Each structure stands twice: as C-alpha cells, then as structure tokens.
Amino acid sequence: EEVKRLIALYELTPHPASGGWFRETYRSDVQVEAEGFDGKRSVLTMIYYLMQAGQPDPFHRVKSDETFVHNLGGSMKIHMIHPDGSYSCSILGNPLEHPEARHQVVVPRRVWFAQEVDGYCLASVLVAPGFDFKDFSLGKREELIKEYPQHRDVIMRCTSS
Amino acid sequence: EEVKRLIALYELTPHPASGGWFRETYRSDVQVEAEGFDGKRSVLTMIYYLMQAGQPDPFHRVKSDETFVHNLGGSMKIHMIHPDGSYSCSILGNPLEHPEARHQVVVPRRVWFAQEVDGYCLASVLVAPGFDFKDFSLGKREELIKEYPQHRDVIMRCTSS
Numbered sequence A, B: 001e002e003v004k005r006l007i008a009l010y011e012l013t014p015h016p017a018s019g020g021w022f023r024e025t026y027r028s029d030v031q032v033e034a035e036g037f038d039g040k041r042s043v044l045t046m047i048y049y050l051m052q053a054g055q056p057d058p059f060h061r062v063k064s065d066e067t068f069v070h071n072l073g074g075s076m077k078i079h080m081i082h083p084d085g086s087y088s089c090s091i092l093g094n095p096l097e098h099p100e101a102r103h104q105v106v107v108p109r110r111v112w113f114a115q116e117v118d119g120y121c122l123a124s125v126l127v128a129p130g131f132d133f134k135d136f137s138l139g140k141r142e143e144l145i146k147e148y149p150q151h152r153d154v155i156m157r158c159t160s161s
C-alpha cells in the first residue's frame, strides 16, 4: 500500500546491507569459473529491490556489473564513484515521466555505488557473475573519504557513522 | 503514442524473428565455457523488448534461462511448451493492477515459448549465458504440431504459416 502490498506480495525483507527491501528471486543452475573470483560462481542472480525516501542504500561495490531494471515507482538516483575517482550519477526510472531517466542502468564492476529515491521505487537487480558475499564490499565512511576526499558530501549522505 | 516514444527513445528496431521491437543494450565482457554451448559465451546480455497487440512473438527457444522483467504497459502472456510436452502460461505485469501478474518471469532453458499482449508492453529481457544465434531455434508450425499435437491451438495462434 503500495509499498506494503509489494513487500507482502513479493515477500521482501529489510536488506542487511541497505535502507531498502529485497528478496533473491533467481539463481542460475549454470556456473562460471571467472578470473578474479574465488571459486565457481553462478552465471546470474536476480533480486527484487524496493527503496523508500530517507534511507539511502549506502556505498558498496561488487566484482560484477550490476544491472538495475525499473519496475514501478519514482526515479532512483544511482550515485557512482569509479576507481579513477570520478563521480557520475545515473537516473533509473521512466523517461515518459522524467526525460533523463532510463529503465535500465548498468553499474560497472568495481564502481562504488549508492542509491536514493524521493518517493519509492521497485527495481529488479541482476548481477552476473551471480552475487556471492565473498565478492561484496560495504564501504566504510572513513576509508572512502580518505580515498575520495573530493566526494566527501555524497559519501557523508550515503554512509552510516 | 507511447509506443513510438519508447521506440524513439530506446532506439528499438523491429524484431527479425518477430514481433516485437528490440535492441541489445548490454553484453558482458566476461565469458564462460558452459557445457552444451558451442564456444565461449558472454555471461549476460540484455535487450529492451516491446510488444503490441495482434503480433505474437512466435514460438522459439534457446539454451539459457531467459528472464523477462516488466518495465511499462499492460500484461504479457508468456506461453510455454516444456520438453515433457506440458503447457503453462506465465503472466508478466504489475500485480497492483492485475493480481495474477508478476514483474519477473523466468523462462527455463529449452522450453518453447511465445508471447502476446492485449495492449503494449515494454520489457527488459536477459539471457545468461548471453544470447548467441547459434543457440536459437525458431519453431516451425509443422514440426511443433508433430511434436505437441495436444497444443495445436496455441501453436497455430503463435507461429507463421
């Protein structure tokens, strides 16, 4: 209602690492052995991911491209700090309502990213090679400020204390 | 027309085996030698795929699970004939408007599948291992009816002369 209907209906649960809601809906039987990965991985995993205003999914990164796909709701800012230190922002949403928004956004592997919404957004989020906690890094405020001092504001807004 | 804005904005072209409008938006750098695949494959490819009423994507199949994700518009019937010959139908869409629809539908590899809509639908469709024409089969009316005589109606509706 509408957020709760979607949480009920899709059986989302509060995301350990984030201010949002999720459930992994698919994990492929097929495996890849990929350099830079410790061990076999699944070819693909997909979650539902729902976000609400006020609670930013904080900076984090993985070893795969992460593909976001907009299902419902408002737009979703996806903040990105790339390894060369540069900052970009992609808008996930519906260009029919917001011309700068796209229904697909691919976050390159190794980019630190965080996300915020002004209302709520339901997304499907896919990762290939498939998600595994050994490949996940939750960013620490102080380490990120030290690495990227020129991005202090966005880092402050999108990390916990 | 909403359709043409999407076709314009997402640069869709009409689907060779269609249809159906599409564009491959992403193909992963990472590869993976999966048994039963002739050669390496990308781990993941994604397309926009847009459908309108009266024009059924005909029956086809690939060697990968194929994941549909609903972006905009009405529901999309996904007809499936599975290797054991049984028939199922998944509804891709928004369960807030249609209780039985879902934002994600995974078509298992090797299933023959076809899709129709009553209005229009924009979906993102992902394949892992990533799409490659050597893995694709377009269904032939005659061979499919030979194979699955109990599903003549649906094969008739979703194949071309």
Ligand SMILES: Nc1nc2c(ncn2[C@@H]2O[C@H](COP(=O)(O)OP(=O)(O)O)[C@@H](O)[C@H]2O)c(=O)[nH]1
Residues within 6 Å of the ligand: A016, A017, A024, A045, A046, A047, A125, A127, A131
């Ligand atoms: N598949 C997938 N899972 C994710 C992603 N981000 C976070 N997770 C999940 O975090 C979930 C929580 O597991 P975990 O927190 O370690 O167990 P718990 O905290 O004791 O309930 C796992 O199911 C992971 O799937 C993602 O992008 N993909």
Ligand SMILES: Nc1nc2c(ncn2[C@@H]2O[C@H](COP(=O)(O)OP(=O)(O)O)[C@@H](O)[C@H]2O)c(=O)[nH]1
Residues within 6 Å of the ligand: B016, B024, B045, B046, B047, B125, B127, B131
């Ligand atoms: N990536 C991907 N591509 C698809 C899918 N279905 C059809 N195609 C595409 O079909 C396209 C064929 O290009 P096409 O327009 O036929 O060029 P042509 O050979 O001159 O006709 C390729 O770009 C494939 O990507 C799919 O599920 N995924």
